[PDB]
């Protein structure tokens, strides 16, 4: 499931801003 | 009505923009209690104001780190704009000042925590719950955009829930006063519009894209474009194919196809009718926009609050001493702060 794939991914915690 | 409101809203903003507030507190007026959250660089702490006893959220920025990441202008932007705006869903800047080592922005403490933590804990928001928050962002972007402001970092981590269950927008780090286009590669990867990513030049329509991302994530519990690395995310954003959870209503899907629209002549917010294409969308049909602005709608969720200074709606963070050198760092760079 999409949910399962998101939850196993490494961006489920607070995301940092970028200024690339 | 909206026109008379926005017009006088604008006169008030300009007077503060033209002559910003400066140096309205100092560090030793506050006792630092606990870290509330952190960003790319720099941290926000819960503090207690000695003379009044009120609690505040103090954002501490290390000038040297600001300079190193090349965020001088953005930091000046952040403070100049935040001290000048006034809207029921924007967090209030109560004090600002600087010392030899740091810049400080003291905001109203919003004790309900980040939308982010609730969202992940709960899983996702039902559509009426998501709609109630969305409505507040729509009104806020109408306000901001009307001042020629672009916000550029909408996401649940920068959205706070107040004691009434309403939203408080924080983090004006990338806010910018601009007529026409701009080019800075900034924001948060999951929320970037494709024109930001493609180095095209871009305008305020990127905030309406990001709203689409927000609404999706609120309702789905995960973003429309995710991957393990930013670069994979950009790829998916650029493709722009979006797929929706089975539980999304037809109305929601239609709205999101019009916000997450790679074509600027067709993205909602960005058209001849402006924000009204959004406010009059079927998904928002049950929304009383006046009542929302007035804060008369019953919130879907009211955080637990146990007395002032309670931080239980926030994660815990590693604390660390806030150094202040005896030599002034980057004085000239930050003079107008
Ligand atoms: N007024 C506030 N009240 C309570 N917490 C706050 C307040 N402002 C910011 N925070 C917390 O601190 C974190 C970082 O604040 P932010 O303004 O987003 O700094 P940054 O630019 O480094 O992301 C936020 O994500 C939130 O958890
Ligand atoms: Mg932030
Ligand atoms: Mg920021």
Report on this model:
The complex is a heterodimer of chains A (20) and B (337). Helix content of chain A is 30%, strand content 0%. Chain A has one helix spanning 2-7. In chain B, strand 1 (30-38) and strand 2 form a beta hairpin. Chain B has helices at 2-18, 63-68, 72-82, 115-122, 127-146, 194-197, 205-220, 230-239, 250-259, 276-279, 289-293, and strands spanning 30-38, 43-49, 55-62, 93-98, 102-108, 149-150, 159-161, 167-169, 176-177. In chain B, helix 5 (127-146) runs antiparallel to helix 7 (205-220) and helix 7 packs antiparallel against helix 9 (250-259). Chain B has two domains: 1-19 and 114-304, Transferase(Phosphotransferase) domain 1 (Transferase(Phosphotransferase), domain 1, Orthogonal Bundle); 20-113 and 305-335, 2-Layer Sandwich (Phosphorylase Kinase, domain 1), CATH 3.30.200. Chain B has eleven helices and nine strands. The chains are: A mainly alpha (20), B alpha+beta (337). It is classed as transferase/peptide.
In angstroms, what separates the terminal alpha carbons of chain A? 32 Å
Q: Total number of β-strand segments of chain B?
A: 9
Question: Which secondary-structure class do the elements of chain B indicate?
Answer: alpha+beta
Question: What order do the SSEs of chain A take from the amino end to the carboxyl end, as H and E?
Answer: H
CATH superfamily caption of the largest domain in chain B = Transferase(Phosphotransferase) domain 1
CATH architecture of the largest domain in chain B: Orthogonal Bundle
The tally of strands of chain A reads 0
CATH class of the largest domain in chain B: Mainly Alpha
What is the tally of helical segments of chain B? 11
Helix content of chain B: 25-40%
What is the total number of structural domains of chain B?
2
What best-fitting shape of chain B do the alpha-carbon axes yield? globular
PDB class: transferase/peptide
Keywords: kinase enzyme, phosphotransferase, Transferase-Peptide complex
Assembly: dimeric
Entry title: Low temperature X-ray Structure OF cAMP dependent protein kinase A in complex with high Mg2+ concentration, ADP and phosphorylated peptide pSP20
């Amino acid at each position: 499931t999409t949910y399962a794939d998101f939850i196993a991914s490494g961006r489920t915690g607070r995301r940092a801003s970028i200024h690339d | 009505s909206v026109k008379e409101f926005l017009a006088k809203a604008k006169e008030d903003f300009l007077k503060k923009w033209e002559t910003p507030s400066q140096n309205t507190a100092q560090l030793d007026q506050f006792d630092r209690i606990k870290t509330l959250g952190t960003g790319s660089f720099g941290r926000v702490m819960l503090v207690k104001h000695k003379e009044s006893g009120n609690h505040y959220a103090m954002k501490i920025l290390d000038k040297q780190k600001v300079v190193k990441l090349k965020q001088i202008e953005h930091t000046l932007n952040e403070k100049r704009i935040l001290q000048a705006v006034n809207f029921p869903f924007l967090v209030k800047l109560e004090f600002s000042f600087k010392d030899n080592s740091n810049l400080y922005m003291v905001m109203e403490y919003v004790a309900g925590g980040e939308m982010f933590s609730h969202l992940r804990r709960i899983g996702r928001f039902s559509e009426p719950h998501a709609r109630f928050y969305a409505a507040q962002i729509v009104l806020t972007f109408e306000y901001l955009h009307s001042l020629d402001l672009i916000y550029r970092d909408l996401k649940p981590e920068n959205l706070l829930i107040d004691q009434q269950g309403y939203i408080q927008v924080t983090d004006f780090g990338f806010a910018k006063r601009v007529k026409g286009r701009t080019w800075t590669l900034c924001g948060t990867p999951e929320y970037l519009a494709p024109e930001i990513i493609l180095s095209k030049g871009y305008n305020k329509a990127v905030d309406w894209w990001a709203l689409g991302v927000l609404i999706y994530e609120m309702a789905a519990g995960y973003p429309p474009f995710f991957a393990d690395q930013p670069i994979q995310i950009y790829e998916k954003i650029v493709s722009g194919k979006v797929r929706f959870p089975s539980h999304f209503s037809s109305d929601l899907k239609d709205l999101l196809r019009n916000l997450l629209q790679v074509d600027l002549t067709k993205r909602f917010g960005n058209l001849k009718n402006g924000v009204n294409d959004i406010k009059n969308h079927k998904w928002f049909a049950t929304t009383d926009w006046i009542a929302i602005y007035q804060r008369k709608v019953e919130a879907p969720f009211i955080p637990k609050f146990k007395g002032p200074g309670d931080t239980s709606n926030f994660d815990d963070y590693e604390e660390e001493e806030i150094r202040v050198s005896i030599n002034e760092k980057c004085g000239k760079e930050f003079t107008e702060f």
